[model samples]
Target chain A: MYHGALAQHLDIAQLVWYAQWLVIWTVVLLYLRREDRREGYPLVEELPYPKTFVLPHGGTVTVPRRRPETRELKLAQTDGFEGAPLQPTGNPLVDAVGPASYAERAEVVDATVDGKAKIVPLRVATDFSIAEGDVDPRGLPVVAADGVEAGTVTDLWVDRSEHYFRYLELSVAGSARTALIPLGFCDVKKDKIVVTSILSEQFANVPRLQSRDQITLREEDKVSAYYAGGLLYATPERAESLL
Target chain B: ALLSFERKYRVRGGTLIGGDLFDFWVGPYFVGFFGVSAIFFIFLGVSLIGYAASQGPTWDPFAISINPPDLKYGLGAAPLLEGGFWQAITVCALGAFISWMLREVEISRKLGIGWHVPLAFCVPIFMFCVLQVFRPLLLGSWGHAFPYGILSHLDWVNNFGYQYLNWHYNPGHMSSVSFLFVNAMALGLHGGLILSVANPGDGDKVKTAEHENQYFRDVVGYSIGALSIHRLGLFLASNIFLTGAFGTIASGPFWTRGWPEWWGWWLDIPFWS
Candidate 1:
């Protein structure tokens, strides 16, 4: 008598089938998320990077894990702001970066999974495997955040250590020579390093690093400081917080 | 535009800093302490970038890149030119962006309105800050911050993704991407529903909320309700961004391993044991 669709009954088979489909699809949906769960979303991991594990019974087995630093970790739950140091290589640069970036290269000693150890970047992270036909930033605009076009990206400086690039060498307008720009100021919006806090004209005087290969610490220090000094906080008053 | 009404609405009182000193409007834009900060930072960041470019190896946008200090610098303060440019530029960026956000709040208050716009804008700001400030802090270095170059950042993402072995397996990332997908679908449906209702047959008058709800119910047996749909959209979109933030942050410090193997703990449940 209700007639509110409840009046229309079907065989229990239909309900069973509906349940079956729902359960299957629900499980399927769950599996969809699991399919590519690696490091981060959009799938960023140096996969097929091999690892070795000692079997419980005997010998060792090897398989590739997703993450790089999958071996030794930095922080723990109870560590608070500081975790125990992993290892200090004692080199000036190595000490500065700490254990995380200075990951172990040849020896995958500390394992994450049974056989997989968090490896090093030098071994896996490379642009060559991907950037095959490369060289020359031939025609890239160097726009400032304040809407000034100071230069163009015209060259790629390779690290030579791992057959990969380390910097984007720049060629600016009204300048006679090229300059070295690091990966720092890269906004990647239009692929330009937007400068701020100073006039575009001042860029003509930034320190230069002119090594065809590796850069020295002294060279880097001078260059880094120069860029850092490219300040909008030219005075103490302007540097203070409004609050 | 309304001369008489404009005068009444234009009265100002809500000033965050400098009392009524820097409080005013230039055309449609508000000027405050934050505004000045924003302008100064914007000028500073691009100015350093230009300087870096002039001393760079190439020209134009793609040619020059202002990179952060090497990982060796960690999170330590750098000298003015010793990767210090990256730090200064980063500070300016946050200063400017936050100033903009705060300005939104101040101006919104000047009108004595709810903080929805500023609050909404905070999501993107939070997302941006998460990448630079929060994530880097957790990861233990300013070098962890992505370079400010278009191709450079893209390459960085690619390298970073691979660094983890596979980012697709990241649960948070998967969740965000799913939410984003679902959000897009819902919008599509909402847009289709609205348009369909808006354009009935040639002779029929325009349809209203009832039609919008009833239309879905007629075919699908239920409607989210016209008003409810909008709320749902915002909720879903917010989830997409927040999850994206969480997922990205989780990549380095939180869960630095193959994501699939993470399920091993699940299979080792006590019941089975």
Candidate 2:
């Protein structure tokens, strides 16, 4: 029979072999079992949609229509010549002129009077002669007709395609306003500007500027009404000539 | 010269006697010892069969053929079938059968199958296997392979020499000696039965006989119970000692110097070390 020492020595080796077998079987068994089990926990759940409001039934509404005129006035005059014929140069930085020769003849004279100035064609002798010249009306002097002080010209608006000056954006009466004045009404007299058809009360009474659409219609109405009421250049022959 | 030879022979005889007694005492210490030994031999046999199966005709020299003519016959001999799962199944079946047999024996003898005997045998073998597997996993990269995965850093027996020596001087030898002495006492107590069959003792005839039978049965029952308890106690004591050794080795200088990761709370801390 084998003795204890022999058995003890043998037992050590036997133990090692069994341990390896156990590890291998454990891995195999656990892997096989894992496939049949449900994997993990559920986290979230679904719910139904909630109610809310729909439109048109929610707020007030309004629609727009044209208004009838309260008063009638006749068209006083017509002219084939619309105003001073506008001249445009392709370059935006150069002021619009009738032609290159017209621009060369014009002189850069100091037109300031009582701290106000207007740039006019130097060859014009009187206010009416200066008015006949087609200087940009938007570039007119900011002083009042009697040479009283007003705010300076802050910006100018012009239509280059028509070579027409549309508006003078000026700081006046303590704020900014775009004043729409006709090109025929402005003139240069020495260092001052003279307006033929506008008074201080008429200028101040003009409606505060609206957006462009409102300003355009209002300016057209004001010009028509001023001439038709005989409030500006009353003589028919003169008015016709002026137009 | 004559005295020296005599002394050498005497010493050899003592060693042989001591070894023989230890073997006999350890034989009945646990049922698992028999089971494990049986399984180990079976595994070895199967390993040899597997080796032969893989090598085929080349294995003939190892198995059968002393004569060159016998090699041809050896090739046809299929001791283990190729690619059969039967070998593993049979080994497991055999282990179960052995356990069943031990249970049968316990039942027949009117003794409950005490787990201690098997546990004592199984635990050590299990411990040893665990150690072997872990030792390589633990320290194999460092080129040190211990017999068991036991951390071999500290020599507690040597370091705390005085305390251990004092234990040896006092109760240490008592447990070992008592273990063997109890086994001898069991043999002696059972010897009466074997001897009584040959020489019948006179009693007050039947009265004496009944009394003796009662006395012997009580003695045998108590002795076996006591022996079982003692074996269990030894198993426990050995476990405590093994744990102490493992604990010391895990905590001591070798672990500290080589793998500081194994010191104290880090003993079972799984990391690269």
Candidate 3:
């Protein structure tokens, strides 16, 4: 100990810094772990993994394992058990399998901030009129991005709270069923409303509104997802890399 | 009326510097004080770049480079022909980028929205400054900064990375790459989920968040959820630049040896050894 006082001071500082680092890392990991647990937790294997979770209010509760229902779509699997890759059994795009898979949302309708149904046709919200200078899409033919005529626009679906047109009600071609096309996805021209995502034939399968006048939240999600998936999966050529 | 609600969003009085001087919109673009500052800096930077290229040997955009002052000059300025152009250009570039960032802040404030967009933008700017100003100043040499050319900057990166010998071994570099890959994966999942739900089959009803969660739960036993995935994505994406900057800045200042050698602390652990 050449310089006892100086050496002691340096050692104490180093200890403090080390402790600081440990504390910071511990806090960071805990936060990340909790956040990660929000979505996927209590691993969904063949078995249940239960544990006790502590809450911020000093209470501890036993958390049970949950297994959600899934589809029975067939898949081709690799030989290895630990980290095997699964391949689609059928057309991934058309069947909405693999990359085009959807969530199993609820069957309930979406509610507006004001407690009314969010997406309703102009027929119900008759007070909400189209602006004077706007090109009203009503009674116009709806064409696909592929230039194929999909259907005819029957009515306009307005988001009552947002005060904007949310969707265009379409009487799909070659079908008795009608569908709501998201207005954001449509290119409304003076003549026809062009939906540049899916093919004309696909319109027959556009997610139908639960009620004739209103669209549900789950329905809205699926409808938008389907059209968006087509941007990548519509044609075989679309899925491939540009190279 | 269509877009009548936009009037509320277009509320005045969020300007940082000038009150009513440049507080209007040119068509759709906001013309704030920072916006004017951004334009001025960008124009000057571009002009200087063109002038620098004219003085260089090759006019080929890829070959023409505005290099930093030599190591002999240290932190001092060089002749206008030598590295002075790069120094001035650096100032202009930082001015433009910072002004643009401030413009975003003003826009966010005007809309009464969160500062996330501008804050997110600061990540790349932070990395740029780390390479240009931070590391250079730390090493006491403007020469440490990268050249201003498309191919030359890449070449500089390659040469600089080689100086450390196996840059992949750098802990910061590893973290950066990990974040980047995770970011891409999260984006893919988020994009795919949104597309699948938003665009239902021709006559099917549009799905909801429950469907999104269930899809992931079915596939991977848990969905990150509709909202959480975006936050996860933002975190991962922002960290890529953050960790990358950390790695680059640490190269000369903190660690002088090969990145692989930095792992010796593990070997020195008594139990592991």
Candidate 4:
């Protein structure tokens, strides 16, 4: 039917593409108009951000609040970030379907800390160091400050950016659960991954994360803060620097 | 005298901001409001880098990394020696970029032309902003931003790529890479085509667009005209950087699985398996 009368050159693909573009643009314009009739788009200014305007017709004209922060830090909830602040450089075509949510940093070590099945739990940081003989964190016994067998060191979380070891994946001895303890505060010896901060049973309250594969910026903050808070709570002097 | 034909186009007017404070050239280059600001920022940023390198670990350029503040720093301003300098440098870099862009605006206005050049320059500028300012801001930590060193940035990409499990898996990245390859192909064809036409017998009359089209027509049945090839070129070339920005920005903050796993649906779909 499309070929019958609409196009004699039989260039249906081109026609389809144009139609698709038209539909897409129409939808976008409709969205902008319906959603942003007051502001009318292109509210580009910085500092206080999203150029605002005071309208003569009573209310006001301004940039729509993109709420980019809440959206950006929604954590590694996606493959990467959801609603990223960076607008793509408009070129051949604008990727309207862009810039959102934190995606996965990488798959968290795909292993169940509890199950007896053959799940090779990988460390967060230096997954290679296990093979490199730098530090065999795997299978190392973790003892609490209270001298109780809390768990065994199962993995290490590396700050993928700095390449610094950030967290240790601990498999609790009693409970069939894995926890990411603050590796920064952990005392690592040749034979053991020693954690003196939290007790053996305290691993249950370290704020359970829903997803095992990726951690969001906020999620990471909540996590590290939970453990790191102890250090600050232990000593008030640590809060401030002399400088 | 200084490389000919300038007095007319460089006519004294149409600067974007600032009065007569710095409306002249610092030797050969323009020194408008933006120019002055750009110069200051560039110097400050470079100096900060040097300072950071001196204080931090190594002398190796790649090894030299001026990282932003840690995640705990949040979006707050930091101390100078700490991630503060990185923050300052980011500001300076952004300032320089913006100032440079504005200077382009001023130049174009002075020359009485469209805003094409300034807009064109925005691709990389937008790319830089995306990398340091925009994405970092969205992530709630300056730490989310990449470092400011040659090797350090590369390392950041490597880590970021692996973190998302796979870079190639991202459709944005996929399209961008394809665009880049196609851009390169177009450039190669044009360069080769031009040379083939130009580098003929010593005294032979140079070939024209028709010759180029004929050659292409003979081989591929339809070759684009000379100017059309350029239009094709600018079209393709324009996409390379934008696509680059799209490709990378789409990753981590966009797609977070092993790129191959994205094809998991295909892997899951079983006609053979």
Candidate 5:
């Protein structure tokens, strides 16, 4: 006979009794089996700093001996610019640029030391000297004064709010070092980045500051910290700055 | 002469009667009879002290018969001679025992019993037995008869039959014994039949193919069964309600006596009546 028959034959009173018994049995069984338990390990510890390195402009610096540490300091304190605060109104609709405006102003330049192409704001250029190819800015040979050759351009750091060129990440000698040269270090002559510092062997041995600790901050703060820690430098006051 | 007449008229072999003008008939010459004549022995044991008096006694009886004993006939007669209350209790107890035993035996030998046997033979027989036992109680009242008869006439029996048949026919439902046997059978048959026949062309291959297939079959079968049962149940319920209403209206005050007030009106309207 089907178990359902039991349900049909039993009245409401009997069914309630059966259901109560079932609940009691289930609770008892669960209680008896409660001792079996398994615990899990805590989360793994995070590393103090990431191991990956970033290199830009393929290691070319006019002062090949000037390590990123000294270069970065020169740019942070003496570069012909002051830090500016940014306020975005949080309105993309009003601030967003149209394609026609963006297309009219788009221009590509080249960093002289490493032949890597650099895109810059067209309004900043006085004349398109590189377009005439009389003196190809991309072809301007750059050699480390201390006999070290530069490599490639990795990335460009810009001010978040003003969209101004803030730092040049240069690959110096054989090591991956970011030369936090100020925007003034770039001449934008024809199409190239030219620096005033000459290479000195003592500059290569300088210790650089690492950027991976403290409370959470924006990318600009991280770059600023590296510069403040004496790891980068700008060009002399006479050189033209790429804003 | 009176004694001879009485002796000749005594019943023999249940006393056969023949329609004949004149005939010489020879019944059982010795008129053999065998029966169980029970004599209930009531032993009342009582003790009293002081002024309270008690009587303890046992009553017994002796039987004598002038016929050869037949064990078969005696056992048959035993049940007949049993008191009405005793008989009723015994029959009910037997029915319960038999039903229980059948279930136990079937469960024990489930592996041995072919799937079809239970569906085709055992299920129907069991249902019929149960119905027989309960029908009288359910339809005993004249009020109950109206609803019960109407329900039966409207094919509630067929609805149950279809359920039993589909459950037996569907194979996808047979994944585990934990499932209701009939429902499982229905699922199994529905799934197995489709799987065995239909070609599931190369499409997105199912991860748990067998389980998914079985589940699909069971769901489809169950849905169809539910719809069918619902339609049938609704139809039966409505018909029963209508029939009962009609009976109530026609019978007026004397419905219980089977005398419907509409009978006179109905008879006048009908040519045959």
Candidate 6:
């Protein structure tokens, strides 16, 4: 029995190693499959089970749901099944399909952690003043990327806690419709504030604020997304590559 | 002055080994256990390379090489003047690379972030080990490993590839090259998209991620999202080295014949015949 014991062990040893690998690798693949489901999982919605994820702010979200759009959605999928490609039946840009997509954020104005409106017009925040030497952006004509006049800057919206100008309230050139452009998007030249991402025509479509003085978080998202989307969608040629 | 929020994240106790022993910072750099270990290995390895160079035939940076032992030595250790320095250097290099990766892990843990950075880094390290350690072990000789000098290593690669005749025909190498090309294209698109938005024309405002996505959607009819693009890049980059390593390993251990001739199985199929 002792004579051939080593040989027998060697033959079975290879089989044992293979068996161990098969089990370990199967478990690893299974674990990866479960982990990949972290994004979009649980195909059947009516299942009894629920899941929760911890929030960054010392809170947990159980079955976190997105805020539903107050208005009717325009776009529909090409195919009549789930996970189908979406296409715009109407104007893709205004319909907010694909790259122009915006979440239905809370309609209420964002507040500072210290319990105050985060953004307010300089007219309302009388205590906060633009420095004496700085160029007063008020009354500057807002020029588009095409060098066409879109509007005139009426007021600067300032963030209370951040202590910086957030938006330039624009009295749009042709219509009574007013809009707010993020200050970061403006060139702020000596003569005018140049908005290069969009043309003058696109300014009319910038998401309007519900209130004259205050901007909602949802409106803010849509406004930014509209202009940002225009960087590609503004001109037909802009969508094409250099090649 | 430090940012007010910086102090909150600067707290300790996230090291993988030796507890808080080497958990301090040297100015901007975090000096963890791995950091110290990495530095030690790097220092020792560089010193050995320098010492080896002193005894070499030429002082030229490209020509000075620390070669592995003769094939006669097999898997055993060689004398100090022979392939011993190469062995020691290989150990040091592996130690340093591992320490560096673990250091990234320690820092990520400290910041309470995901281990993606360290995990992604493992691909290159894995590639290095496959070339130096795994293949050599499989072949049962330290002589199979590449030399230390840049030019000499390149020469070794050239000679090794020719031994198998047409490395391009190696399926694994072909896979690696394909991955590399695709990875490059993805990177180029990403960089161009970012620059188009972030660095707009002289008078234009900087654009956002929506624009970046929109540009791709307009061009390719799909945008893989900003975060997912990085994940794709990581996947492709990882595959480049992985497939390349497979190709190198397959050369001697798995396939002794020419890579072009390995296609014989395809011709031998009854349907093809």
> TM-score: which is higher, 2 or 4?
4
Which pairs clash in model 2?
A: A111-A191, B131-B149
* Chain B, candidate 3: TM-score: 0.94
User: What lDDT does the true structure give each of the candidates?
Assistant: 0.59, 0.33, 0.73, 0.60, 0.29, 0.75
Q: Which stretches of candidate 5 lie over 4 Å from their true place?
A: A1-151, A190-192, A198-243, B1-273
Q: TM-score of each candidate?
A: 0.49, 0.19, 0.54, 0.49, 0.16, 0.54
As a TM-score, model 2 comes out at: 0.19
Superposed Cα RMSD, model 6? 24.9
Residue B171 lDDT in model 1?
78
Estimate candidate 4's alpha-carbon lDDT, on a 0 to 1 scale. Answer: 0.60
Q: What DockQ results do all the predictions give, each relative to the true complex?
A: 0.01, 0.00, 0.01, 0.01, 0.00, 0.01
lDDT of 6 by residue, B66-128 (tens): 999998899899997899999999999999999999999877755534579899899999998
lDDT for each residue of candidate 3 in A1-243, tens digit (9 for 90 to 100) = 543235434666667789999988887786645544543343322223444444222343443323365456545653333222244566543455433445555456666533577778899998898999999888899989779888888889876755667788888888987887778779889999988777888777766665787776667766776676566556655443222
What does candidate 5's lDDT look like per residue over A1-243, in tens digits?
544345556666677888999989877666433322111111111112211212132322221122233111101111221221112222211121110000111112223223322223222322322233343333332333334344333444433222245554555546656343334434444444443333333223222323311111223333332222221121122111111
Which stretches in model 6 have alpha-carbon errors above 4 Å? A1-243, B1-8
Model 4 chain B: weakest 10-residue lDDT segment is B1-10
Q: Model 1: what TM-score for its first chain?
A: 0.39
Worst 10 residues of 6 chain A by lDDT: A39-48
The regions of model 1 sitting more than 4 angstroms off are A1-243, B1-8, B79-82, B199-204, B267-273
Steric clashes per prediction: 91, 2, 36, 36, 40, 1
- The lDDT, on a scale of 0 to 1, for candidate 3 is 0.73
B8-85: candidate 2 lDDT, tens digit per residue: 111100111122121111222212233445556567646645554454454443342111112223222212333122
